[model samples]
Target: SVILSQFDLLRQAETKVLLDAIAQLRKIIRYFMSSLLAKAQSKLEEEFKQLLASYSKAVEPDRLPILIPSRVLPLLHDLAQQMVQQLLQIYRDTRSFVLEESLKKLGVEKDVQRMQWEVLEAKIGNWIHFMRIAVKLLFAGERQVCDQIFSDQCFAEVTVSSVSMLLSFGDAIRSPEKLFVLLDMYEIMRELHTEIETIFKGKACLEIRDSATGLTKRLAQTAQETFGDFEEAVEKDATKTAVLDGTVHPLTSYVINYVKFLFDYQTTLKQLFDSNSQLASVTMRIMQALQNNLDGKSKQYKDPALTHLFLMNNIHYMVRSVRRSEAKDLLGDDWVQRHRRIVQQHANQYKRVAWTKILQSSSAQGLTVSRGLLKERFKMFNMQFDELHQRQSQWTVPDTELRESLRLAVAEVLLPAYRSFLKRFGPLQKYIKYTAEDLERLLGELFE
Candidate 1:
């Protein structure tokens, strides 16, 4: 009766008195609510941490999957269900900070144009490790844990916020670098796509799914562009600086090794190429561009003999490299056979260009000459052959099979002719500088 009478008096009182009373009540209520909220929020955060830690093992740094059994999830749910928002706040903060810490470890977004190629590969490899663990195991485990507890859409909110940071890491890495690592990133996203979808189900996670999908699409486009860029790089490789001694050009080794590395991502590359068998086509095109580039590079050499040797070295390396690696499976037996033929052609051309003059200078067999002419012929052969030998001795053929083939080829052409010339002119042995045995021994020493 007294409280009702007080309320009636306040309603009937002047406006100033009523406003003053309500203002005091509002301040008291606000202070009470804030203090209580702060206490409970902190307490709930601790409880959630304890619960999660009980069921969770630390993610190991070995780059392998962590396999702590999530079977006690139902027990977590029995306590966690009533405190869904409290647990979600803890979960969101946990996920967000871990992602932030990893991003910090990954350092800032790179200007890939200035970064070293190996460093970029190393970082992307780490990204793969983190992404695989988080999506496939960590987030998957969280989703299962959340499913056992939350009746509402709490995990959806946790997922979007957590994955938003991961997606930020994805965005950070999007600046173009090398194609092979990009394909690796693409493959990681491609493989974990299903896990992402399953873990992040609901309207709240739609954006995350789309963001992941968008990232993958953009990566595919980037990889495709990077592939084209590689082709262009090969074509416009204006490094006309020839390899000295006509050994393998640096470009030849780089491109061959790069393409061989691509074999590691064969299936993913096929997907990126999309709708057509373009890997083989692009590989062949790259080889063609490389050959064209090499042809231009070889022209920088002044000696035609060295030019053929450079071509022979580079082309033979390409064939040998392809045959030895998985590239042979993609390039196929015919491609290897065809390049072998091309290598032989260059080898034959090398023999002709290098030895033709040496052979011609000795061709005096059928001509009936005086004793003076005979002595002069022997002198001519010795000087020209020695001069030719001195020049070619400095050149190189690095492969043993190729070197032996070249030595035998030279012997086949020169040995028979020299033997005939000597037999017919045996009486002039006094003037001859090298006998057949000496010439044979010298042939063995030419490329070395």
Candidate 2:
């Protein structure tokens, strides 16, 4: 419209160049776009060459002590950032020319503008696709780990960092439907897990073992009162909670990603983990490393309360995660119920250990409040209550309704026994330090 409206005026004014070339104005924009593409390709090629030449596969045994691949995560992020910016800047810098009303009226239908930008988007995808390939080529294959190539003591830090970076940096591609889809993230994970199952399985096993045991120990210690219970429930459940749920675990992203793979592609994961499942599973041998480690932890603790709580937390977390995800269908309701039954048992045993002591201590034992013997027993009760509080003050009951229910359970058992005791003691005013209300408050304070 802009050009057509002005064409007659320009023709009368004898502006020949505008009159002749204006119809091919899109060609002008196309040429400009081609130039930008040329620049992007050139820059990406140069950077990729640098990466190919300088990229080190020398990672530490533990992926630390920084070997050749300066920084896997930062490098990937930097590459992604630079590439994204390169493609984005094409539109950001030239949007005025392409999207301007004047340009739109110059035979530039919204389609033409959108179509041109789509070309640019394709270039962005191609660039990302090439990047993913380069990244995987360097670190994703079976050859990525084995030291047959490294003549030195250890240039394997690259592998360690590469694995971690793949897991972490790969996460940056959140909800990637296209540009990032060029990256076979799941295959990369499968390859990494596969390689570990075959060769680097030792390190991975140690990490998982330490991670789970440490997780249980933490449950006994801080376990948060709820591990961010204050952080309003939301979509971030997969990321925020430290529960051993399939969604959120105290394990690494690799484990979580692999866990996701198990849920998402059960057949493939089963092949790796199960020898008899017609298909294989992650470790090939299909060992229940996670479950084995958990059972180990269950028996390690001396305190039955701690043991039960740890098992309770794990069982509840697994059940919640499995029930809420496709894992339920994959693992089945029977699997869920089995673990759920364990949770119930753990809960029952938990009460027997933690509250049982408290309840037993609360019994008045037919001792009248007026007697010195009654004062001794009441002081004993005070000592026991104080001990329970001091020990459990730091532990947590993560489930809100369950925590509330436990308070109810405590009251159900102790109220009748204590009410009669309090009635008998009501006349002997100096007999008790804690009143009925105070005891009720103590029940409320147990699992915080």
Model 1 vs. true fold: TM: 0.72
Q: What is the C-alpha lDDT of each candidate?
A: 0.70, 0.45
Q: Which residue pairs collide, candidate 1?
A: none
lDDT, candidate 1, 1-448, per-residue tens = 5556554544543233312344443444555467333444455556657876554434444442433454666655655653536566665566444444443443423222345767757876877876766665546445564566643255555455446656666553433237767777888898899987777665755777899999888877878777788877888787545336777888898888778777667777778543235787777788888899999778887578888987998999998887787454556788888988999998888889888876876777535647678787778889888887887787778898889888988999999989988877767446878888899898888777
Model 2 worst lDDT run, 10 consecutive residues: 226-235
lDDT of 2 by residue, 216-252 (tens): 2432222122212211111122323343221223532
Which residue runs does candidate 2 get wrong by more than 4 Å? 1-249, 252-257, 264-288, 364-370
Best by lDDT: 1
RMSD of each: 9.2, 23.3
Which runs in model 1 stand beyond 4 Å of their true positions?
A: 1-119, 136-153, 172-177, 240-243, 273-276, 326-330, 365-368, 426-429
